[PDB]
């Protein structure tokens, strides 16, 4: 299994990446979803998470191609409007920024898919 | 599709019950998971949510029988430990109490079990 972490920052991205590594999943740190989108074409991942406002259209369009892949959207303002909108667009799970904790993010990931990658 | 909500409260029961009703699902508010469990044996449901600390064992044992049903666990203290433990136990999704909003709860529910088909 391979996880795609998209975050302009470095602390959050590195934290999430190193966290998922504990389980044994290959997490990649990026900036904009654009990178993961163009990279997902040459590579084959299973988990894709991005912390941007453009995650709606990103995940929405993704479901059209890879409806199997797990689309995870995160935002600094965890509001119901963003949650319902993101879910309706394509997002499979909404994450608040900051998040509860690394352990939570990973746990929710493996539990969200539960179709690949295990300890 | 039938949605079962377990909460000894009142405001939450009515708020959630009506919230889901907006879509077109059977929302029923109960007290303890014991009720929903004993009732789920006499009736066939699809969505099951409970806001109790004993949801871990409840959802954990449920997955053993109905691996299809969506187990939604909620707690007043939305902590990573509770989230990770909830998923590891059997919980499909973790909900914070209070939650972001009704629209969010319902949206997440219908989004979690969208493969249910039968519009």
Automatic annotation (TrEMBL), chains A, B:
GO terms for cellular component: cytosol; protein-DNA complex. GO terms for molecular function: phosphorelay response regulator activity; transcription cis-regulatory region binding. The modification 4-aspartylphosphate is found at residue 46. Keywords: DNA-binding, Phosphoprotein, Transcription, Transcription regulation, Two-component regulatory system. It comes from the Bacteria. GO terms for biological process: regulation of DNA-templated transcription. Residues 2-112 form the Response regulatory domain. This is TRANSCRIPTIONAL REGULATOR.
């Amino acid at each position: 299994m391979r996880v795609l972490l998209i975050e302009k920052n470095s602390v959050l991205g590195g934290e999430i990446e190193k966290g998922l590594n504990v389980k044994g999943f290959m997490a990649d740190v990026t900036e904009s979803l654009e990178d993961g989108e163009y990279l997902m074409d040459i590579r084959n991942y299973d988990l894709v998470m991005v912390s941007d406002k453009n995650a709606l259209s990103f995940v929405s369009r993704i479901k059209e191609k890879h409806s199997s892949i797990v689309v995870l959207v995160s935002s600094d303002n965890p509001t119901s409007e963003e949650e319902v909108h993101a879910f309706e667009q394509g997002a499979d799970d909404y994450i608040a920024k900051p998040y509860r904790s690394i352990k939570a993010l990973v746990a929710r990931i493996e539990a969200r898919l539960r179709f690949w990658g295990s300890n």
